[PDB]
Amino acid sequence: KKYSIGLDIGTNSVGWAVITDEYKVPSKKFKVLGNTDRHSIKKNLIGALLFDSGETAEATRLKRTARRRYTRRKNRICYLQEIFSNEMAKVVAYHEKYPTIYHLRKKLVDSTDKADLRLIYLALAHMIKFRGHFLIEGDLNPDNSDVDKLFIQLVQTYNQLFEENPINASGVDAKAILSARLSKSRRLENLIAQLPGEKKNGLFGNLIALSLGLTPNFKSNFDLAEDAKLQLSKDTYDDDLDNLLAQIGDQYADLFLAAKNLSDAILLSDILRVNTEITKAPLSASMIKRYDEHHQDLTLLKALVRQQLPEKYKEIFFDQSKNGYAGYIDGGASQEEFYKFIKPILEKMDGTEELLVKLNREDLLRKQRTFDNGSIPHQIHLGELHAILRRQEDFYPFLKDNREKIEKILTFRQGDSLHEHIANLAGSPAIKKGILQTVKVVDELVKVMGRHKPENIVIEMARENQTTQKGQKNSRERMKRIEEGIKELGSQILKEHPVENTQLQNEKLYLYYLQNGRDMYVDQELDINRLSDYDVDHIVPQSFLKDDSIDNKVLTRSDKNRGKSDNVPSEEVVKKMKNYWRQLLNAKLITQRKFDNLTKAERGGLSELDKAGFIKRQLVETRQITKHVAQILDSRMNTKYDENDKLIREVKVITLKSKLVSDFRKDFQFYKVREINNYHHAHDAYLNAVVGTALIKKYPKLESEFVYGDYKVYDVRKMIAKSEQEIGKATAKYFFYSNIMNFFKTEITLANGEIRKRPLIETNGETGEIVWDKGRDFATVRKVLSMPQVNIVKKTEVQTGSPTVAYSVLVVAKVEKGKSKKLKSVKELLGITIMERSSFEKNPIDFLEAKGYKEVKKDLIIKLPKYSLFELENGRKRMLASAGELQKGNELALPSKYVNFLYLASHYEKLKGSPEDNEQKQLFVEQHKHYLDEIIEQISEFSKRVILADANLDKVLSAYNKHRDKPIREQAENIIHLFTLTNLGAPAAFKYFDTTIDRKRYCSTKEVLDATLIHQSITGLYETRIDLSQ
DNA sequence: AAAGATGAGACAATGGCGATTAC
RNA sequence: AACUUGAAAAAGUGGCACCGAGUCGGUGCU
DNA sequence: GTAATGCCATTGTCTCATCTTT
- First CA to last CA distance, chain A: 43
Residues near chain D (nucleic strand), Cβ < 7 A?
Answer: A 223, 225, 247, 467, 469, 472, 802, 817, 998, 1002-1004, 1006
Among the listed residues A269, A267, A296, the one whose alpha carbon sits nearest the alpha carbon of residue A364: A296
Among the listed residues A654, A653, A736, the one whose alpha carbon sits nearest the alpha carbon of residue A691: A654
Q: Which DSSP string do the residues of A457-512 spell out, in sequence order?
A: EEEEE------SSSHHHHHHHHHHHHHHHHHHH---HHHHS---TTGGGSHHHHHH
- Yes or no: say if A368 and A289 are a contact pair by the CB < 8 Å rule: no
Half-sphere exposure of residue A662: CA atoms within 13 angstroms, side-chain side: 14
How far apart are alpha carbons A108 and A131 in whole angstroms? 18
How far apart are alpha carbons A480 and A483 in whole angstroms? 5
Is the distance between the Cβ of A881 and the closest atom of strand B smaller than 7 Å?
A: yes
- The distance from CA A440 to its chain's CA centroid, rounded to whole angstroms, is 19
What's the one-letter identity of residue A93?
A: A
C-alpha pair distances (Å), A901 with each of A274, A853, A894, A926, A933: 69, 56, 11, 10, 12
Whole-number Å distance, CA A75 to C1' C9? 16
Among the listed residues A737, A935, A469, the one whose alpha carbon sits nearest the alpha carbon of residue A745: A737
How far apart are alpha carbons A141 and A639 in whole angstroms? 30
Handedness of CA A281, A283, A288, A293 (dihedral sign): positive
Q: Which DSSP string do the residues of A580-617 spell out, in sequence order?
A: HHHHHHHTTSS-HHHHHHHT-GGGTSS-HHHHHHHHHH
Q: Provide the positions of strand B that have an atom within 7 A of a protein CB.
A: 3-6, 8, 13-18
Beta pairing partners, A1023: A32, A1016
Q: Which DSSP string do the residues of A100-167 spell out, in sequence order?
A: SHHHHHHHHHH--S---HHHHHHHHHHHHHT--B--S-SS--GGGTSHHHHHHHHHHHHHHHH-SS--
How far apart are alpha carbons A465 and A429 in whole angstroms? 20
Judged on CB neighbours under 10 Å (0-12, 13-18, 19+), A635 is: middle
DSSP state of A700: G
What are the φ and ψ backbone dihedral angles of A621, each rounded to 5 degrees?
-100, 125
SS3 (DSSP) at A897: helix
Among the listed residues A480, A556, A572, the one whose alpha carbon sits nearest the alpha carbon of residue A519: A556
C-alpha pair distances (Å), A431 with each of A62, A424, A426, A462, A683: 11, 13, 10, 11, 20
Is the distance between the Cβ of A183 and the closest atom of strand B smaller than 7 Å?
A: no
- Yes or no: say if A358 and A342 are a contact pair by the CB < 8 Å rule: no
Handedness of CA A806, A807, A813, A814 (dihedral sign): positive
In CATH, the number for domain A1-31+41-54+429-465+610-787 is 3.30.420.40
- Yes or no: say if A1014 and A870 are a contact pair by the CB < 8 Å rule: yes
SS3 (DSSP) at A638: coil
**List of residues 6+ apart from A454 with CB closer than 8 A:** A2, A3, A4, A5, A18, A445, A446, A637, A651
The helix or strand, by DSSP H or E, that contains position A546, with its residue range, turns out to be: none
Whole-number Å distance, CA A234 to C1' B3? 29
How far apart are alpha carbons A650 and A455 in whole angstroms? 7
How far apart are alpha carbons A533 and A535 in whole angstroms? 7
Radius of gyration of chain A (CA): 34
Whole-number Å distance, CA A397 to C1' B23? 92
A963 is in an annotated binding site: yes
- Yes or no: say if A794 and A1014 are a contact pair by the CB < 8 Å rule: no
Whole-number Å distance, CA A422 to C1' C6? 27
Extract long-range pairs of A853-858: CB within 8 Å, 24+ residues apart.
A853/A811, A853/A813, A853/A814, A853/A815, A853/A826, A854/A813, A854/A814, A854/A815, A854/A816, A854/A823, A855/A813, A855/A814, A855/A823, A856/A811, A856/A812, A856/A813, A857/A812, A857/A813
By what method was this entry solved?
A: cryo-EM
Is the distance between the Cβ of A67 and the closest atom of strand C smaller than 7 Å?
A: no
Task: For A711-759, list the strands marked E by DSSP.
Answer: 747-749, 755-757
Helix, strand, coil percent values for chain A (each to nearest 5):
45, 15, 40
Among the listed residues A104, A136, A70, the one whose alpha carbon sits nearest the alpha carbon of residue A375: A136
- Yes or no: say if A964 and A1007 are a contact pair by the CB < 8 Å rule: no
Is the distance between the Cβ of A417 and the closest atom of strand C smaller than 7 Å?
A: yes
Whole-number Å distance, CA A986 to C1' B14? 7
How far apart are alpha carbons A88 and A119 in whole angstroms? 11
* Quoted resolution (Å): 2.5
Q: Parse chain A into domains and list their residue ranges.
A: 1-31+41-54+429-465+610-787, 66-132+377-411, 142-272, 282-372, 471-605, 811-860, 896-1010
Q: How do A1012-1016 and A1023-1027 pair as beta strands?
A: antiparallel
Q: How do A27-34 and A1023-1027 pair as beta strands?
A: parallel
**A903: alpha, beta or left? (left if phi > 0; alpha if psi -120 to 50):** alpha
How far apart are alpha carbons A915 and A534 in whole angstroms? 10
Please give the protein residue whose CA is closest to the C1' of the nucleotide B14: A986
Of all nucleotides, the one whose C1′ comes closest to residue A42's CA is C24
Beta pairing partners, A43: A28
Of all nucleotides, the one whose C1′ comes closest to residue A470's CA is D14
The helix or strand, by DSSP H or E, that contains position A762, with its residue range, turns out to be: strand A761-763
Q: Could you list the active site residues of A?
A: 8, 538
What are the φ and ψ backbone dihedral angles of A1002, each rounded to 5 degrees?
-105, 75
How far apart are alpha carbons A425 and A421 in whole angstroms? 7
Extract long-range pairs of A153-159: CB within 8 Å, 24+ residues apart.
A153/A258, A153/A261, A154/A207, A154/A211, A154/A255, A154/A258, A154/A259, A154/A261, A154/A262, A155/A204, A157/A254, A157/A255, A157/A258, A157/A622, A158/A203, A158/A204, A158/A207, A158/A255, A158/A258
Q: Provide the positions of strand D that have an atom within 7 A of a protein CB.
A: 2-6, 9-10, 13-15
Is the distance between the Cβ of A165 and the closest atom of strand B smaller than 7 Å?
A: no
How far apart are alpha carbons A193 and A185 in whole angstroms? 12
Among the listed residues A660, A685, A677, A651, the one whose alpha carbon sits nearest the alpha carbon of residue A17: A685
In 10 A of CB A68, how many CB atoms? 17
Whole-number Å distance, CA A1002 to C1' B12? 20
Among the listed residues A730, A758, A734, A755, the one whose alpha carbon sits nearest the alpha carbon of residue A744: A758
- Yes or no: say if A297 and A365 are a contact pair by the CB < 8 Å rule: yes
How far apart are alpha carbons A1027 and A871 in whole angstroms? 10
How far apart are alpha carbons A555 and A518 in whole angstroms? 9
C-alpha pair distances (Å), A329 with each of A288, A323, A360, A428: 19, 9, 21, 36
How far apart are alpha carbons A623 and A324 in whole angstroms? 46
Among the listed residues A208, A206, A232, A210, the one whose alpha carbon sits nearest the alpha carbon of residue A219: A206
Flag residues 927-956 of A with CB < 7 Å from strand C.
938, 941-942
What's the one-letter identity of residue A153?
A: Q
C-alpha pair distances (Å), A144 with each of A158, A238, A715: 18, 21, 21
A994 is in an annotated binding site: yes
Of all nucleotides, the one whose C1′ comes closest to residue A221's CA is B4
- Yes or no: say if A558 and A522 are a contact pair by the CB < 8 Å rule: no
**List of residues 6+ apart from A282 with CB closer than 8 A:** A271, A272, A274, A380
- DSSP alpha helix (H) spans, A309-428: 313-317, 325-329, 335-348, 355-360, 378-391, 397-401, 403-411, 418-423
Handedness of CA A701, A704, A708, A710 (dihedral sign): positive
What's the one-letter identity of residue A528?
A: I
Among the listed residues A515, A426, A372, A371, the one whose alpha carbon sits nearest the alpha carbon of residue A239: A426
Among the listed residues A579, A562, A656, A577, the one whose alpha carbon sits nearest the alpha carbon of residue A618: A656
Beta pairing partners, A770: A763
